[PDB]
Amino acid sequence: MAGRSMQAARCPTDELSLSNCAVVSEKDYQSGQHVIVRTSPNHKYIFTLRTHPSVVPGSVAFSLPQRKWAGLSIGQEIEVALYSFDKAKQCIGTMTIEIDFLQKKNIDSNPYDTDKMAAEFIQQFNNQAFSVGQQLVFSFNDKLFGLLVKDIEA
Amino acid sequence: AEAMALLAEAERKVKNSQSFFSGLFGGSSKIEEACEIYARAANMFKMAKNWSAAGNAFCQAAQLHLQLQSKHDAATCFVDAGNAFKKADPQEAINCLMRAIEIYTDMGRFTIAAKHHISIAEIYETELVDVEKAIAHYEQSADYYKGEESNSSANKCLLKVAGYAAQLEQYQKAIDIYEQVGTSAMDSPLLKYSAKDYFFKAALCHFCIDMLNAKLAVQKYEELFPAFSDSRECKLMKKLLEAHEEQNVDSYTESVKEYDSISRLDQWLTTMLLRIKKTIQGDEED
Amino acid sequence: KAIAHYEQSADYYKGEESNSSANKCLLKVAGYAAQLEQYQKAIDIYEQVGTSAMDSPLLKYSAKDYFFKAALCHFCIDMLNAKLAVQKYEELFPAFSDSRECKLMKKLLEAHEEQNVDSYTESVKEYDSISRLDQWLTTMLLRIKKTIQGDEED
Amino acid sequence: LDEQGEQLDRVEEGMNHINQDMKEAEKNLKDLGKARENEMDENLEQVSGIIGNLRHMALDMGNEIDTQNRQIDRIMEKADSNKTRIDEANQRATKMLG
Amino acid sequence: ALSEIETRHSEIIKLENSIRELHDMFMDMAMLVESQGEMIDRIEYNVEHAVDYVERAVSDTKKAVK
Amino acid sequence: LQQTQAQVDEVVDIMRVNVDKVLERDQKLSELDDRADALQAGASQFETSAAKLKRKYW
């Protein structure tokens, strides 16, 4: 709870870059816990921790979407602190997302049933923290997409 | 006619006597005469193209002055002995340049100390390649030049630090250098048309630093982006680091030559450009 | 107090014909003094430097910006007092670098005198490219247009 | 360049009185002894003024640096002779101890 | 006059290139004399601190006769 | 345009005359340091020698 200064780092592999989880080391925090990244008085962002055996104790790994959302790079001082949600008024029950192809040089017109997408979305992004306007990337049938949280409902 | 006789003739006389040779006085006029023989010897060794016993002669000429009253002209003779073996290949000169530092540093003469403390790093990098100690002495001497606030001597040290922090590859410290020196320069008309060069030097130092600090350090340093060497920095950098964010090296390599068409590239920049181009390429595979 | 230090110190440097600091510390007096509070000192200083600047074959090219500083200080003056310096000074106006001193002025005098802003501001729309503007020049720009505000702003 | 050329004038201010004490303290020492191409055409005429201002101060900075180098020609000789005088005067003054 | 349109392009790009060549020599020139201004700063040290030793020493050697 | 080309190329050569100057600039900037640095100690130590001298002959 004290909040520890950490250094925004780079996501280890490409698997965890698709999870939108603050990848960390098993030696500091644990996967499942939630944290609030603090960069300035007017920048408080909330991430999901996801341990991984290739993170150096005392550094937090972030993916490009998080860094391209939180404006973070490999090597600045940030304060990360465990944050405990309020389940009663913060559990997601209906959430709108603006979806779009991540790679502009991979654009197709094939149909992808959303009914399968929502099911795979909850089967991969479960127990995660999502804020309004947050952008991330989803891998549907070996296809990268660029999600964008538009609205959340409790 | 050489001084090999002068050295031995004054070496007969350099005895620390306990006899009638002293009497009541020592050999004070005698030892000044002796050190003058050593002075004349050490000069004509350099006159005789010797370069190896010559700086040794300056060493000994100063050595027999160290314990008398004054290490001072003996310290300048150590500076001269540092100027002795420096032209030559032997490393004896650096030791004498230490001796000068722990006389001038030891005495309050940080100015001349910083004058040759930089030349030591010029030898540890150019000649006697020990470049992390060269850089530690550029940095230490720049600390001294900022001690007396002589700024651009320290900045000339900091380029040899920072410019050689690129191939030593601590980019995090390379960008830690050009900020506090160049944001101090927009008030100066002395360097303002140069200051944007330094925030190309700050900006292009990537370890793939893809934050908008590169999009913001260009702004805190308030900088008309329609400046026409910032056209050679800022929107240059836009094409250089948007194509990396496009993951597309081809128009990158065409536009870096388009920069070459309007301002030719030099060694430190070109090497860091092929460096960051490696980072862009190794990112565009995956 | 520092400007008094420059003043008495430049009095010593004047009385020793160390003309360097004699001109310099006076410039440090006037460049801040004019904008903040002292007005006749501005032209008196930049004319004291300007005459002996015109004298020496080393100095008479530094006089261009010195009489620029004498001119563009307006002292709640709407007039062509800068043009009084024009038909005073040895410009040799086929030297065009003084046109960035006075043809600048020959626009903006009648821009300020005809209380017009889209010619006054246009002068620096074009002059910012052909001369980089430091803090003091733009503060004086803002100074003469505060006189424009006092001419226009109800 | 101008403020540094008159900095060199304060160099002259130092050197003269140094050498004045050092043509003197040697004697005190022995006393001690005892329709847009036309817009391009306008840009060309802007540049025709530019090259005039260029060349005028180009010739003038030639004269300027030549003056500063002859000022250096003064400094070198007088400061170097005075370098000889300081070392002979210091060692002569010390060799008259006792 | 496609000959003269292509030359109006090409020769005048060479005109900017020539001014770019002198511009290279001039940014070299001005930043060089800039950099020299720091040796002038060390003069500013060694112009009167040199006097601050020398004239101050001869204030006591001339008065060492006293 | 070509009249201006010739004029400007004369001025390229005026800058080349500044390049002819700049070696004569920089070497002299070097050697004046090469004297001032060596002048500093001879200037510095003479007051100390003066102190060594004048304690005796009052």
Residue numbers in the entry:
A (entry chain C): 1 to 154
B (entry chain L): 8 to 293
C (entry chain K): 140 to 293
D (entry chain H): 50 to 83, 141 to 204
E (entry chain I): 191 to 256
F (entry chain J): 32 to 89
Paper text:
Refinement of the class that appears to have the best-resolved density for the entire 20S complex (Class IV) without symmetry restraints yielded two reconstructions of 20S complexes (FL-20S-1 and FL-20S-2 at 4.4 Å); each reconstruction reveals density for a 20S complex which differs from previous reconstructions in several key ways. Most importantly, a tube of density runs from the SNARE complex to the center of the D1 ring of NSF, suggesting direct engagement of substrate. Regarding substrate loading, both FL-20S classes reveal a spire in which the N-terminal end of the SNARE complex is positioned over the D1 ring by two αSNAP molecules, each of which is in turn bound by two N domains. Critically, and in contrast to previous studies, the map is of sufficient quality to permit explicit assignment of the four SNARE α-helices and thus the determination of the absolute orientation of the SNARE complex in the FL-20S complex. While both FL-20S classes show clear density for the spire, its orientation varies by a discrete rotation (if viewed from the D1 end, counter-clockwise) about the hexamer axis as well as a slight translation in the hexamer plane away from the split in the D1 ring in each. In the first class, protomers A and B engage one αSNAP, while protomers C and D engage the other (left). In the second class, the N domain is shifted by one protomer counter-clockwise about the hexamer axis, with domains B and C engaging the first αSNAP and domains D and E engaging the second (right). This difference results in a 53.2° rotation of the αSNAPs and SNARE complex about the hexamer axis. Finally, and most important, density consistent with the N-terminal residues of SNAP-25A runs from the tip of the SNARE complex to the center of the D1 ring, where it assumes an extended conformation at a 61.0° angle relative to the plane of the D1 ring. While it has been previously speculated that SNAP-25A is the SNARE complex member upon which NSF directly acts, this is the first direct structural evidence of such an interaction.
The archetypal Type II AAA+ protein NSF (N-ethylmaleimide-sensitive-factor) plays an essential role in eukaryotic trafficking through its disassembly of different SNARE (Soluble N-ethylmaleimide-sensitive factor attachment protein receptor) complexes. After fusion, NSF—together with several molecules of an adaptor protein, SNAP (Soluble N-ethylmaleimide-sensitive factor Attachment Protein)—binds to the cis SNARE complex, forming the so-called 20S complex and disassembles it in an ATP-dependent manner. NSF is composed of an N-terminal domain (N) and two ATPase domains (D1 and D2). Here, we present higher-resolution cryo-EM reconstructions of the 20S complex composed of NSF, αSNAP, the full cytoplasmic regions of synaptobrevin-2 and syntaxin-1A, and full-length SNAP-25A in the presence of ATP under non-hydrolyzing conditions.
